[PDB]
């Protein structure tokens, strides 16, 4: 009988708490409405720089630390003089120095969610002038072209030091004394071995806190490079809306899909959750085997070396 009381009682806990959040969210469709111009505007004008190319060059950061190159910064390395030179950032302090940065993370600045080329050629800022000293001694997020990599790794057996530190300070790395990025012909295929390290061999050993069919399909080794227009994912779905790169924001060696997601979306604070992501997948600067599919660390660089 009584139900005719939902009118002025049961209902009076809806519209009030409906028109409310449809509104307290309305005043969101605002902030997240202008800012998209309050920063789209201050975009009208690009950012400039001036990387005074130091005197000392080399074939790559290794030969340079062997030519007096001791301060870590913007260098000009020239692998096989059968290809146009190019700037880069060297690491000449952390571990014998001479590490040629290949990718770097420490802020947003550079979106990695691009297509083929940008990944093949190279995108980002290969460091920027150190507010005072006329040279670019501090690294800036970027992804030194693929070719350049697929090539610098071709200088015989090439080491690779993927390091990282998480927001609460802690830090670990993962060295792959055996790393090679195949030619853009084998869809940049990635071969890696001799994994030493404390970060957890998430590229070879696959993601740990999982199992078989679930683990192994988080194997980055043997993997092709894939983008959101270059589908070579380990995931084989006859559907175009489903792809390990269209999701998991940013190209990378995807094997249905990842255990490590460098070049991912940039998540502030580390922890993030599906109810945030463009597609609900764990797309972010993630290294599952260490912090978990839901911790998107602060900085994560991939700097390599010959020998």
């Amino acid at each position: 009988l009584y139900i005719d009381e939902t009118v002025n009682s049961n209902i009076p806990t809806n519209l009030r708490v409906l028109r409310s959040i449809l509104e307290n969210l309305r005043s969101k469709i605002q902030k997240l409405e202008s800012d998209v111009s309050a920063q789209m505007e201050y975009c009208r004008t690009p950012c400039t720089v001036s990387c005074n190319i130091p005197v000392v060059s080399g074939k790559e950061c290794e030969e340079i630390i062997r030519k007096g190159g001791e301060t870590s910064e913007m260098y000009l390395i020239q692998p096989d003089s059968s290809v146009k030179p190019y700037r880069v950032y060297c690491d000449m302090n952390t571990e014998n120095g001479g590490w040629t940065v290949i990718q770097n993370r420490q802020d947003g600045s550079v979106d990695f969610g691009r297509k083929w080329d940008p990944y093949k050629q190279g995108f980002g800022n290969v460091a920027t002038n150190t507010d005072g000293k006329n040279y670019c001694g501090l690294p800036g997020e970027y992804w030194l072209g693929n070719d350049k990599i697929s090539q610098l790794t071709r200088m015989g057996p090439t080491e690779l030091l993927i390091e990282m530190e998480d927001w609460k300070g802690d830090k670990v790395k993962a060295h792959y004394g055996g790393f090679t990025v195949q030619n853009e012909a084998n869809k940049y295929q990635i071969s890696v071995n001799k994994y030493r390290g404390t970060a957890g061999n998430a590229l070879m050993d696959g993601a740990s806190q999982l199992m078989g069919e679930n683990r192994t399909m988080t194997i980055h080794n043997g993997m092709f490079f894939s983008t959101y227009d270059r589908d070579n994912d380990g995931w084989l779905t006859s559907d175009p809306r489903k792809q390990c790169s269209k999701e998991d924001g940013g190209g990378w060696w995807y094997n249905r899909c990842h255990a490590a997601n460098p070049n991912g979306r940039y998540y502030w604070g580390g922890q993030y959750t599906w109810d945030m992501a463009k597609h609900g997948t764990d797309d972010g600067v993630v290294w599952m085997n260490w912090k978990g599919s839901w911790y998107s660390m602060r900085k994560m660089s991939m700097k390599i070396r010959p020998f």
């Binding site: 999982l210 399909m217 988080t218 995931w235 255990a259 599919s293």
Partner: peptide, 4 residues
């Protein structure tokens, strides 16, 4: 991570 992996997929279903």
């Amino acid at each position: 991570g992996p997929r279903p």
